[PDB]
Amino acid sequence: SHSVKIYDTCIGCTQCVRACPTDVLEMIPWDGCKAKQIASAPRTEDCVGCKRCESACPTDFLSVRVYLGPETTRSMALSY
Amino acid sequence: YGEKSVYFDLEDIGNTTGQWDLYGSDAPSPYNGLQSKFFNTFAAPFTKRGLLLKFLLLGGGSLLAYVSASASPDLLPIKKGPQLPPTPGPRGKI
Amino acid sequence: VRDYDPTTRYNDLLDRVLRHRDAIISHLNWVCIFLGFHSFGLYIHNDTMSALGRPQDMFSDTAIQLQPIFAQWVQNIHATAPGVTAPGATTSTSLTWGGGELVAVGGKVALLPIPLGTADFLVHHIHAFTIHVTVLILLKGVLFARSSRLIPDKANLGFRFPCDGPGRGGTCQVSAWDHVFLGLFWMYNAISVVIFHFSWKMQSDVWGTISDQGMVTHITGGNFAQSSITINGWLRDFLWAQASQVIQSYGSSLSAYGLFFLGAHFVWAFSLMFLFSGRGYWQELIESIVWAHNKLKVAPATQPRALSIIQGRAVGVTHYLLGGIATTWAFFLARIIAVG
Amino acid sequence: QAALYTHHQYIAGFIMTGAFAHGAIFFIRDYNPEQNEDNVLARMLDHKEAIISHLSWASLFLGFHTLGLYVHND
Amino acid sequence: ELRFPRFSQGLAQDPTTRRIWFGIATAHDFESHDDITEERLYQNIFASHFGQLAIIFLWTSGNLFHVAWQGNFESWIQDPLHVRPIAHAIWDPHFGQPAVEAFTRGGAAGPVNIAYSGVYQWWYTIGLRTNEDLYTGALFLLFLSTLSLVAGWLHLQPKWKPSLSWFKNAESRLNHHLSGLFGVSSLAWTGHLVHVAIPASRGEYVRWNNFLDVLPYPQG
Amino acid sequence: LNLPSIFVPLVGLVFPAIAMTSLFLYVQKNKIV
Amino acid sequence: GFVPPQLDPSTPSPIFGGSTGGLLRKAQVEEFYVITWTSPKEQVFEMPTGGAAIMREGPNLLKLARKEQCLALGNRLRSKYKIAYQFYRVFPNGEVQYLHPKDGVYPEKVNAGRQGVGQNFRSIGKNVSPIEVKFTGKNTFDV
Amino acid sequence: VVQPINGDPFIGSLETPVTSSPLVAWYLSNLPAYRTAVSPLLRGIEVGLAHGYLLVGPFALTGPLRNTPVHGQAGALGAIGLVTILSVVLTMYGVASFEDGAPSTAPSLTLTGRKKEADKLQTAEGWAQFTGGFFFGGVSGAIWAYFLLYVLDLPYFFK
Amino acid sequence: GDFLVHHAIALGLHTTTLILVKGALDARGSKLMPDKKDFGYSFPCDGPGRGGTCDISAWDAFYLAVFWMLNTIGWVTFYWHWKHITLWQGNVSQFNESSTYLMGWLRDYLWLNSSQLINGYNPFGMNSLSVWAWMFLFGHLVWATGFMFLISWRGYWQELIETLAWAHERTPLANLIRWRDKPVALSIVQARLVGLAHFSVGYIFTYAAFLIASTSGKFG
Numbered sequence A: 001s002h003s004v005k006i007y008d009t010c011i012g013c014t015q016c017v018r019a020c021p022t023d024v025l026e027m028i029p030w031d032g033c034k035a036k037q038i039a040s041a042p043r044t045e046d047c048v049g050c051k052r053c054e055s056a057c058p059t060d061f062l063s064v065r066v067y068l069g070p071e072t073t074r075s076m077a078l079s080y
Numbered sequence B: 001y002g003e004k005s006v007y008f009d010l011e012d013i014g015n016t017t018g019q020w021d022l023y024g025s026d027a028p029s030p031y032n033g034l035q036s037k038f039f040n041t042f043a044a045p046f047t048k049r050g051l052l053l054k055f056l057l058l059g060g061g062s063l064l065a066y067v068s069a070s071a072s073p074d075l076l077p078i079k080k081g082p083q084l085p086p087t088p089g090p091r092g093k094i
Numbered sequence C: 001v002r003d004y005d006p007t008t009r010y011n012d013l014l015d016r017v018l019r020h021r022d023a024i025i026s027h028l029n030w031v032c033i034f035l036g037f038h039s040f041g042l043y044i045h046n047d048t049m050s051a052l053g054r055p056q057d058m059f060s061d062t063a064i065q066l067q068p069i070f071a072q073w074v075q076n077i078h079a080t081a082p083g084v085t086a087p088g089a090t091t092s093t094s095l096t097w098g099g100g101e102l103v104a105v106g107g108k109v110a111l112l113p114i115p116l117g118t119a120d121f122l123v124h125h126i127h128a129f130t131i132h133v134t135v136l137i138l139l140k141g142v143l144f145a146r147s148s149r150l151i152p153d154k155a156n157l158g159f160r161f162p163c164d165g166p167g168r169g170g171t172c173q174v175s176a177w178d179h180v181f182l183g184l185f186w187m188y189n190a191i192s193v194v195i196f197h198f199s200w201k202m203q204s205d206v207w208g209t210i211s212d213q214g215m216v217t218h219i220t221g222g223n224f225a226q227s228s229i230t231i232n233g234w235l236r237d238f239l240w241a242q243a244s245q246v247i248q249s250y251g252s253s254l255s256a257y258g259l260f261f262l263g264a265h266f267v268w269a270f271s272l273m274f275l276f277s278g279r280g281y282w283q284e285l286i287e288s289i290v291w292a293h294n295k296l297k298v299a300p301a302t303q304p305r306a307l308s309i310i311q312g313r314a315v316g317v318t319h320y321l322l323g324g325i326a327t328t329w330a331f332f333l334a335r336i337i338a339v340g
Numbered sequence D: 001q002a003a004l005y006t007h008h009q010y011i012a013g014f015i016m017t018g019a020f021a022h023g024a025i026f027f028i029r030d031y032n033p034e035q036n037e038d039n040v041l042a043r044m045l046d047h048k049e050a051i052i053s054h055l056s057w058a059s060l061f062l063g064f065h066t067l068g069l070y071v072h073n074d
Numbered sequence E: 001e002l003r004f005p006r007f008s009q010g011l012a013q014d015p016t017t018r019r020i021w022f023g024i025a026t027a028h029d030f031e032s033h034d035d036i037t038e039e040r041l042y043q044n045i046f047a048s049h050f051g052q053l054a055i056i057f058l059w060t061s062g063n064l065f066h067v068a069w070q071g072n073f074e075s076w077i078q079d080p081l082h083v084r085p086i087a088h089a090i091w092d093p094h095f096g097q098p099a100v101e102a103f104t105r106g107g108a109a110g111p112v113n114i115a116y117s118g119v120y121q122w123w124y125t126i127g128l129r130t131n132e133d134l135y136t137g138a139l140f141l142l143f144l145s146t147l148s149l150v151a152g153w154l155h156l157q158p159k160w161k162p163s164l165s166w167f168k169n170a171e172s173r174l175n176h177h178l179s180g181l182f183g184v185s186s187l188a189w190t191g192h193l194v195h196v197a198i199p200a201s202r203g204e205y206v207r208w209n210n211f212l213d214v215l216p217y218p219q220g
Numbered sequence F: 001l002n003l004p005s006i007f008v009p010l011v012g013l014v015f016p017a018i019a020m021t022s023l024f025l026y027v028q029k030n031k032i033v
Numbered sequence G: 001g002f003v004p005p006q007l008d009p010s011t012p013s014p015i016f017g018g019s020t021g022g023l024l025r026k027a028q029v030e031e032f033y034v035i036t037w038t039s040p041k042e043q044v045f046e047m048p049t050g051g052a053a054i055m056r057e058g059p060n061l062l063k064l065a066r067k068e069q070c071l072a073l074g075n076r077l078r079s080k081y082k083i084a085y086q087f088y089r090v091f092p093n094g095e096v097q098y099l100h101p102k103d104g105v106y107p108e109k110v111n112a113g114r115q116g117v118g119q120n121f122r123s124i125g126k127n128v129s130p131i132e133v134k135f136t137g138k139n140t141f142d143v
Numbered sequence H: 001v002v003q004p005i006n007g008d009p010f011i012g013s014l015e016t017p018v019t020s021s022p023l024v025a026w027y028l029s030n031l032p033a034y035r036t037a038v039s040p041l042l043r044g045i046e047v048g049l050a051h052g053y054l055l056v057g058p059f060a061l062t063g064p065l066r067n068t069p070v071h072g073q074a075g076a077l078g079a080i081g082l083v084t085i086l087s088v089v090l091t092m093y094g095v096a097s098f099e100d101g102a103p104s105t106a107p108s109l110t111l112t113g114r115k116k117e118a119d120k121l122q123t124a125e126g127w128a129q130f131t132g133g134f135f136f137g138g139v140s141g142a143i144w145a146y147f148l149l150y151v152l153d154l155p156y157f158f159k
Numbered sequence I: 001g002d003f004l005v006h007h008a009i010a011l012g013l014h015t016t017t018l019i020l021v022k023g024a025l026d027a028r029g030s031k032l033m034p035d036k037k038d039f040g041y042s043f044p045c046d047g048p049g050r051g052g053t054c055d056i057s058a059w060d061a062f063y064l065a066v067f068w069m070l071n072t073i074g075w076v077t078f079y080w081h082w083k084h085i086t087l088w089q090g091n092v093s094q095f096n097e098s099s100t101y102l103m104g105w106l107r108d109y110l111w112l113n114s115s116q117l118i119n120g121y122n123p124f125g126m127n128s129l130s131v132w133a134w135m136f137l138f139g140h141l142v143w144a145t146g147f148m149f150l151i152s153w154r155g156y157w158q159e160l161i162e163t164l165a166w167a168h169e170r171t172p173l174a175n176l177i178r179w180r181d182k183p184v185a186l187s188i189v190q191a192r193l194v195g196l197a198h199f200s201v202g203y204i205f206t207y208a209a210f211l212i213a214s215t216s217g218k219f220g
Ligand code: CLA
Pocket: B056, B057, B059, B060, B061, B063, B064, B067, B075, B076, E093, E094, F008, F009, F012, F013, F014, F017, H063, H064, H065, H074, H075, H077, H078, H080, H081, H084, H085, H088
């Protein structure tokens, strides 16, 4: 399964959560930014590794990172 | 399953996924009794896969090697050998 | 991608076709494999048999024969058409059908009957192979434009996009534009083989000179039948033999064709740089060059960037096609002008 | 003689590419910045833009003028 | 350790054909294997290097044996400018008779290949003259190839495994390899040239049965 | 005896068969221990 | 707090003629997925597996092979139509696991009670070099 | 004439006249590979006989010895060698797939849903019986075709 | 002519060094990917964001450099062979006059020295060069096959493979046989490797056939 991590430069814009095609990420309360929220990745066994979340992030450098790992049926997107 | 436009079930889950044998048949043996008895006698030793594998491999290799060794010159040009005087190379090379 | 909409403009036939695309594509895949084997493997078998000193085991007119009987039958029907099925016509539509007769103008052959044999059978099934493969690629592109088992929401990504990421095992070249990009190469292959077949057959069996007594001498003297049944024959008797005019043209009025021959080889090889590589390397290199320009106060406001992924593929295929086609153009024109 | 010269030149080319491959592997897997502070190996990483740009200039000069002379003669 | 590959659990749980390909491609990347330590890396590398030596010796011995068995070294010795040396005989059941005739060359009685590696000139320059010498060389190299495997097996047992600090003694290794592997080998080869090859280039045949009596130089 | 006639088939046909059989059966094992 | 609903196996399916893009043998041996929703009226929609279908008025239940297909269909149902949906994973033994929406609220709206997973409280530029974790089995990105 | 398979469109296929006509179902249910209530030995014997009988022709008519007085023997030997290779491959597949004592993985449901006993063929012992039968029948079928073609010399068409 | 070809060889050395050095010095990161060292030596890419990041790892720089290495060594060996072949025939003026323009290289080296090689077998018979002639064509084939892996990428092939899996699971008398490793298309890095390998093998075999046949047909 792939690994997904969130770093504390997040501004809580929620774009990565909206971009994910298999519902890996979600927003949770926080106090470190003006939006009072931060992203989280509790369901990485369903991650396919597409990196749309990285494409959506506006900070420099990124606040969400994806490291590809061992492959499974779910992570290879096999319907057979 | 199949009633009132329903194809899902938590009990008969096999039919929901469609685990069927479309062409599988359940009919008795149509072979003759004496023929079946004959074919059930002389085909016994080959029914053990571990022994059959070694028998097939070793016997096949032995047969192939022997047939290669005993092949007749009138059938294999490589066995026959050259029959013409050699042609010379460039610059008088032999 | 842009206009299909079953909520406002429904069509039953399009839906029915979209509902058995797996069956369609799988059967086309299989027939491509079958044709490729039983057409190109025959040439491979002939090359092997000829190299091993066993010419009596080849597929040829003097050996195992594969005659194109249906084509010969249609030719015979067309050649004898004047008189029974078309009583109002004096002669047939073409001199190639048959009915032994030759027309000569200025001591040169115009047209005459064209015979068909094992070599024609082989090359026609090669043409069938190339065309069916081109159809496979382009039809796959059109039919799976909106979705597939791999990318369920492909229509939201558009007609022209590079990929959808390294996940799912890797998803480079899933867009329809990439299917067109791949189809251009196979189209080039097919048409090149068509024009090579035409050139060799016409030079070997039709064009030539005729004497006062009526002895026809052909340009390559009827070597197509025996030599075109191996790949070594195409390499030796067609490319190497007929390239002499274009490569000896320097110092005469045809030297421009030699210059274009070389320049087109250059462009073709140039395209491979774009085809084989990727844009991350080139952007990283541009960063170093921009540092040097910044050192001397000459960094432009319009910030340099490497070509996009799609533009890289487009530039590659464009220069590949231009180089190959121009090479063949120069070859043909020098050969036919000098020897014809 | 032809075979020997060609054979050993191709083998040499493959070896030369491998040298830089394993050298690149060194920088990722084993290099420790803290224990190499301000030595020659770190300063190499420090002026990489200058190094790469001057190599690029040399390649451009050679390519332009050599290809140009060949085309002029043709 | 569940299934192939035993050295990678991440690959071993992969349910696709990708398990097989990658299993082949990462076999010799010891650093990436599961539960590897620094010491085992060096020890396994040592064993693998012994394996490479064994394979090299086998390759050379095969060349010598085949040249001796099927070549024309003795014939080539007497007319080196007009005779083509023979690499090995050809036995191909797919051949036709014209190929059988065409590939019979060099004075042989069957189809052959001509050698372009230059081993005939090399082996003639260093004093070899007959097929018996070639056979003895091939057998000796066969012995060395077995010695390499036995040593590799021995240095991989618990009693005979070198420690990690042994592999990192740079000064001692440099001394031994400069003095012994380069210099002494050169001394031994110079001795061979003085005792064997140079006399052979003058009509004198020195072998293992008479080399003590003959003097390389009259004044010793 | 003609040694090539016996040894060429053994190395070109039978040995590959045995080796490929063993490797296929090895890579298909559900558990190795 | 939130009690996920129970999967009713007697829900009708949309009106479809069939295709070659649906379930294969994996659903028999490993797992498959089920999406349910409610429609105000019967209407046409594009299937994620190719072609078109007609959803009925009332409850609708559809079986799919992968989670991504369920989410894509749900996003179409939420953007183009004003319809709420849910989906589940089903095992060969008949076990059902409720998947989405997990706690009754959409993931892009911040909701209390959620516990963070996989958060590193530093900037990405402060990860260590690989040599610092060599021969240990750890990752430089793991906290 | 095209309908969903068993009324279930959402399975990954749709019934056609090809895959649902009773004429095809009768023929496919009368084949040795689908006689679930017959011992694997005889089912393998029939398969081996038929395939060994058919494999004789190509080797005897297209080989490198086709224009020699011993072409029939060469063709028969080629058929026997191919049968040996196929039997080896069958044994390897059986060893790789089925473990000793494991239950049959054959489907246990019919079109109507009625449960049926699983096929013994998908087991470690049934597959071995089928393989032995295939080898024996293949050799016998090759020998029979050779005997009919080049011993009695029956009057065929282009033999 | 020697002046011109030596400056071409210098171009080859400088460009190959540029590619490899840029790969090595940017391995740990750059402006486009400042955290590259976390992802290792070989990885496919970093996705289509930030403009697109195809071929960004150091492994990919090695992959690009191998092409330029083959180009440079080809120039070196072409020059050696043509100069010596005109030396051995006693016709140095041929090289001295034809080498100053590129059509001279195409016509007087490549085209002229192939005539014997491509007649190893023909409609009239065969001779001892036939194997080399066969090998020549073999090379041209493998080279070209490599292009397929280098130009077309993975997502095209995976979609195709899914359809074949559907077809096998639906075919009678053949669905009684099941696979145990699920078939998938090759990985991105794997495809780059396979394509480069076919390219290199074809390169080598083609040139070896031409060199050996051309020289031994004239001199033995
Ligand atoms: C080094 C490997 C090798 C060897 C030794 C052979 C040997 C042979 N090949 Mg070749 N072949 C090879 C590789 C090899 N091939 C490869 C890799 C390919 C694919 C590219 C081919 C493709 C090929 C074709 C297409 C043909 C041959 C044929 C032949 C035969 C030509 C001689 C003859 O007149 O036979 C005449 C002999 C016969 C007609 C009867 C042979 C009967 C055999 C010996 C029975 C063996 C039985 C035994 C149980 C087998 C055990 C196998 C295994 C379990 C160990 C000969 C047996 C020809 C042939 O005749 O094939 C049958 C033929 O048509 N080969």
